[PDB]
């Protein structure tokens, strides 16, 4: 029953932004946008964590059938517009509004609630942003190629990271780029990021001090954060136990209560005087800790990225129930031929200075994709024999 709650949690947004169909009105009745939101929601909460694209195709068939079942009063309109397999209502937060850099770069916080379907301006703002990330980080060294599926994956990371009290397990073979994608996805969301470094001596205290700093960023200071554990950031089980309880409770036994909880809480009640607003009169003591756990769990997102293969992943999941339970799950299939030819032309356009031949370039990019798909098979055969 969790996923039903997640579906509704996604639906409940836009107290009046849904009403504002007037700017778009792209053959849209007010209800049409609503059912499209329902569709996108159901897809992203159910039509994600499935291994083969066929499984996806059958859930979308289910969705279309059920939409026709309930929507027995405009069924032809939904068939014309949103039940069609063509792309519909890509929902996003930063693309739809543009800062416009009037007097300062971040002129105004973009409107945040919704966006519409389009791919061009999506890619143009993505490239814009890529240049920004290049000059923000010294030695960024991030030749990220943005093709349709990559754009969708960044969108999904955004969907999970943004939500209050959310987190998402990301699965996929190495090279799928999830670790690369999350850096941008976090920078856009203003969230700070820190990774764990395994010293020459592999031990436990690093975890504790790092989590303390993380809470105090998401607690006392109250900033927005994110956490980027991966397979490199596990050396034994125990780390998984401590993080497990962090997902569940968030109180570390006597890490914050080593004669410190009261000084840190006392550094916070000034915000409490207006935040809970007890008529600006008084407060209590334990309730401050209640509000503190509220704040830190409200602003400590956890991004986990595991391998799908090996031995340890499956029984690690079985060891700790909350891990696969609370977090959203998303698959990354290997790139299909469309993506590869797209990358080939992105790299051949800038490189077709001397190799001038019409009607042969397109076959060139095609054949290059073919070469890649093939070295996959040769790899398989070598390991097999």
């Amino acid at each position: 029953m969790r996923e039903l709650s997640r579906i509704f949690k996604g639906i409940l947004t836009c107290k009046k932004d849904t009403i504002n169909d007037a700017p778009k009105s792209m053959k849209i009745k007010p209800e049409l946008f609503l059912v499209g939101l329902w569709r996108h929601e159901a897809e992203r909460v159910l039509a994600d964590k499935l291994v083969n694209n066929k499984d996806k195709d059958t859930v979308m068939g289910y969705i279309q059938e059920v939409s026709l079942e309930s929507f027995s009063q405009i069924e032809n309109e939904i068939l014309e517009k949103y039940s069609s397999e063509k792309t519909f209502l890509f929902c996003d937060f930063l693309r739809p509004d543009v800062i416009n850099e009037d007097g300062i770069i971040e002129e105004e916080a973009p409107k945040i609630y919704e966006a519409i379907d389009s791919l061009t301006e999506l890619r143009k703002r993505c490239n814009f942003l890529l240049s920004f990330y290049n000059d923000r980080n010294p030695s960024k060294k991030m030749p990220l190629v943005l093709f349709d599926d990559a754009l969708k994956h960044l969108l999904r990371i955004s969907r999970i990271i943004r939500q209050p009290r959310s987190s998402g397990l990301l699965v996929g073979v190495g090279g799928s780029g999830k670790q690369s994608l999350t850096r941008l996805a976090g920078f856009i969301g203003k969230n700070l990021i820190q990774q764990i470094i395994v010293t020459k001596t592999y031990s436990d205290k690093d975890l504790k001090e790092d989590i303390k700093k993380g809470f105090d960023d998401a607690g006392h200071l109250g900033k927005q954060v994110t956490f980027l554990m991966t397979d490199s950031e596990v050396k034994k089980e125990e780390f998984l136990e401590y993080i497990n309880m962090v997902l569940s409770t968030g109180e570390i036994p006597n890490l914050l209560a080593k004669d410190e909880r009261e000084v840190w809480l006392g550094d916070i009640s000034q915000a409490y005087c207006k935040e809970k607003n007890l008529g600006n009169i008084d407060p209590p003591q334990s309730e401050l800790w209640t509000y503190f756990v509220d704040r830190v769990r409200d602003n400590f997102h956890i991004m986990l990225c595991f391998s799908p293969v090996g031995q340890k992943f499956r029984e690690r999941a079985r060891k700790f129930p909350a891990l696969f339970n609370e977090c959203t799950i998303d698959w990354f299939l290997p790139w299909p031929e469309e993506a590869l030819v797209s990358v080939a032309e992105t790299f051949i356009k800038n490189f077709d200075k001397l190799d001038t031949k019409e009607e042969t370039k397109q076959e060139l990019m095609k054949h290059m994709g073919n070469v890649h798909l093939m070295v996959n098979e040769i790899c398989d055969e070598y390991y097999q024999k």
Binding site: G174, V198, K200, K366, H367, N370, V371, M374, I378, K385
Partner: protein, 796 residues
């Protein structure tokens, strides 16, 4: 090349895009001048090394080599360098900053899939700095992402290049004058290839130096003539290409069979490493053995006859070297593999027929279902042509199948001419022998090994420890792969008292013994004593240090040896396994073998101190024979002993000490011997029964069984004149040696009193494991659960 090339060209043909016929990848990539320059820098002259050098040249990213032999390490050591190991406290801090801020190139040579994490973020800011790093142990398990960062290159030597390398080294050592002629003509013809290049330079000069008014230069006529002159020396070079490709070639044809054999031998002894760890050794040790063999016996006169003598001697030398490390159950197997790997090239024996020899009824009625399985096994060239009325004659071969030793005297006449030819007739006879009678596989194995390789191989070996000491220089240790109930420690100490004049020092591994071992080793270094490490199978962290210690750098006083002992623990790094001397001291197999060994343990002063040639000489002989019989009884299995017991010599000299006390204090009161003694030998029965040898025995039945053996062998008296059930001695030492000499090699179990048929079961299980060993060296959730699903509705 093959798979990838056919793959890419079929892609191109299906795509219909145009592509050129012919690969010639190396030719239009790099000018051959740099190829030759590298070949001066130690790059192997053959194809695979050529593409490898290209691959390093491209240097898309920093590389990482799979390096079973060491071609890349030497190449980089020479290519432009002419070093700092990974494991060093200074390396992680010092060597990094030096290389990263001044470009020293920081080579590394100890990757074992374990990465100090600080290695990585250095990998991915001086602009004068590169870095090459390589692995040692083959078959890596690199992480996916370690493949993402760095390029991977395999320098797994092929046999093909290997025979050329051995060809060069034999041309060196057999007579240097051959190399003088070789390198002389080779330098000349290399320079003449460069002279063709100079002709090309002259053509280019003729063509574009003037870049106008070529014709008005009437000296162009002279230039044209000059072109002709250069072609003339190429003609001499052309002649030299013939004079080369025959003369040196025949000088090489005298030896390139040898190189072929050498390469074959090496690729045999590779695979035993996969049969079990600790049978691991370099190419370098093999190279020393090869060069030595040339020195040992090669040149007398009559060079072709000496080529044949290579083929005789080298094989035996390398063979014995590997046997010194081998275990009993793997003795027969290594020789068997050597035979096959020899014949997979010359005789062109089919791998399919090999698998026929390893793996495998309506027609016949008399023979057994156990036999009919084998008829269908053989049935599925002329194997599927002569199971008919020919085989089903049933005229004289019934006696044949009854006769023991089917192969030798009653030979099959099914194919008499085929067996006569013998080029493959051995292998045919053996496919027959295995398929019909797996019982007598192993002696047949010894037989055709003796045939195709010589009977010298199928003959006993026993390592003279005094002889073995001559091998051990100070700078190499002596390993010992031991088995339960056997230790040479007493003999090592005995030798250290005989030739060396001092007792050795000993340190047992464990916990908290590193520094103790190190300080005693330093004392040995300065002085020249001997050290006995013990129990290396645990506490392996100290082992890796030893290889660094035993080095030319830290100088060591002469006469210092090291002796190492350990047991079967994988995850034992091969730093010393790659550089050591491996010896095996499990007890000998045969009855005569164990008897002879026992007759070289406590001898020549036990035996020679008598003061009586009559009685207690006979008692020694009795007890020794008893020892050697009851030990060997266990070969059969539960029929002979309920569980295995580890009798050794300790009980023997215990009994000897007792009975010598008994006789000395008996005859201490004897002023005169009636006939040499007046013993009442019934107490000795009870003692050798229940006290000395009673320690191991956990069963009840074994007690009275062993008492019975005592009864039948002692007889309750020293007859002096009778036939042992098995001869009886005279009273001289070398006569005992001869007595051993006339003993048969293989006996029959009625010597123990035990029935002939026992033999049968032993051989079967023995055969059943043997092939399985080599069968490993070759390169679920489905309807089964539905079968169980149907089962569970059948139990009551």
């Amino acid at each position: 090349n093959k798979l990838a090339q056919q793959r890419f060209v079929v892609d191109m043909k299906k795509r219909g895009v145009p592509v050129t016929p012919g690969l010639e990848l190396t030719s239009f990539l790099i000018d051959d001048a740099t190829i030759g320059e590298w070949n001066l820098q130690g790059l192997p002259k053959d194809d695979l090394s050529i593409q490898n050098g290209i691959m390093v040249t491209n240097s898309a990213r920093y590389p990482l080599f799979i390096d079973p032999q060491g071609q890349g390490q030497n190449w980089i050591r020479n290519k432009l360098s002419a070093i700092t190991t990974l494991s060093h406290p200074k390396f992680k801090d010092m060597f990094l900053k030096y290389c990263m801020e001044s470009g020293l190139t920081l080579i590394v040579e100890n990757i074992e899939n374990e990465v100090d994490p600080m290695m990585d973020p250095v990998l991915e800011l001086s602009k004068e700095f590169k870095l090459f790093m390589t692995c040692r142990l083959a078959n890596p398990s690199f992480s996916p992402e370690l493949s993402a960062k760095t390029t991977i290159i395999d320098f797994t030597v092929t046999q093909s290049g290997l025979e050329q390398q051995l060809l060069g080294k034999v041309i060196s050592k057999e007579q240097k004058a051959l190399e003088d002629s070789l390198n002389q003509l080779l330098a000349d013809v290399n320079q003449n290839q460069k002279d063709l290049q100079r002709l090309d330079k002259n053509l280019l000069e003729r063509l574009i130096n003037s870049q106008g008014n070529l014709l008005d230069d009437t000296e162009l006529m002279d230039v044209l003539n000059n072109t002709k002159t250069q072609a003339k020396e190429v003609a001499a070079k052309l002649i030299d290409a013939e004079i080369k490709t025959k003369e040196i070639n025949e000088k090489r044809e005298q030896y390139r069979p040898v190189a072929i054999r050498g390469s074959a031998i090496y690729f045999t002894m590779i695979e035993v490493s996969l049969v079990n760890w600790m049978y691991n050794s370099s190419l370098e040790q093999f190279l020393k053995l090869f060069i030595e063999s040339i020195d040992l016996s090669e040149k007398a006169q009559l060079p072709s006859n000496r080529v044949k003598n290579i083929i005789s001697f080298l094989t035996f030398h390398v063979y014995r070297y590997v046997n010194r490390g081998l275990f009993e159950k793997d003795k027969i197997t290594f020789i068997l593999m050597m035979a096959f790997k020899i014949l997979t090239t010359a005789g062109t024996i089919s791998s399919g027929d090999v698998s026929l020899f390893l793996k495998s009824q309506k027609q016949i009625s008399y023979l057994e279902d156990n036999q009919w399985l084998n008829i269908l096994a053989l049935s599925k060239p002329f194997f599927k042509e002569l199971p008919d009325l020919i085989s089903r004659s049933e005229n004289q071969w019934r006696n044949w199948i009854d006769k023991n030793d089917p192969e030798n005297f009653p030979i099959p006449d099914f194919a008499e001419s085929i067996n006569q030819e013998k080029e493959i007739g051995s292998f045919i006879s053996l496919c027959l022998v295995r398929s019909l009678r797996n019982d007598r596989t192993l002696i047949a194995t010894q037989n055709f090994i003796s045939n195709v390789l010589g009977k010298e191989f199928t003959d006993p070996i026993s390592y003279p420890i005094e002889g073995i000491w001559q091998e051990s220089s100070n700078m190499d240790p002596v390993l010992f792969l031991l088995s339960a109930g056997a230790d040479p420690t007493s003999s090592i100490d005995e030798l250290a008292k005989k030739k060396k004049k001092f007792p050795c020092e000993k340190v047992s591994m464990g916990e908290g013994q590193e520094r103790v071992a190190r300080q005693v080793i330093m004392k040995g270094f300065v002085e020249g004593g001997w050290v006995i490490l013990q129990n290396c199978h645990l506490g392996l962290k100290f082992m890796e240090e030893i290889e660094t210690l035993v080095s030319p750098i830290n100088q060591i006083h002469e006469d210092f040896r090291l002796w190492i002992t350990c047991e079967q623990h994988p995850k034992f790094p091969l730093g010393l396994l790659q550089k050591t001397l491996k010896v095996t001291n499990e007890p000998p197999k045969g009855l005569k073998a164990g008897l002879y060994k026992t007759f070289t343990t406590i001898i020549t002063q036990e035996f020679i101190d008598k003061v009586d040639h009559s009685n207690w000489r006979s008692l020694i002989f009795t007890i020794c024979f008893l020892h050697s019989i009851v030990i060997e009884r266990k070969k059969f299995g539960p029929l002979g002993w309920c569980v295995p017991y580890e009798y050794n010599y300790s009980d023997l000299e215990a009994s000897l000490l007792y009975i010598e006390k008994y006789l000395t204090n008996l005859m201490s009161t004897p002023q005169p011997n009636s006939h040499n003694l007046p013993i009442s030998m019934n107490v000795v029965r009870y003692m050798i029964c229940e006290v000395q040898y009673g320690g191991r025995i956990t069963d009840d039945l074994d007690r009275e069984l062993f008492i019975t053996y005592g009864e039948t062998y002692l007889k309750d008296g020293i007859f002096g004149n009778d036939y042992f059930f098995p001869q009886n001695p005279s009273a001289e030492l070398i006569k005992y040696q001869e007595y051993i000499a006339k003993v048969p090699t293989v006996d029959n179990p009625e010597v123990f009193g035990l029935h002939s048929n026992a033999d049968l079961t032993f051989r079967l299980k023995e055969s059943k494991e043997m092939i399985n060993t080599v069968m490993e060296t070759r390169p679920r959730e489905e309807i089964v659960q539905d079968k169980a699903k149907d089962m569970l509705k059948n139990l009551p």
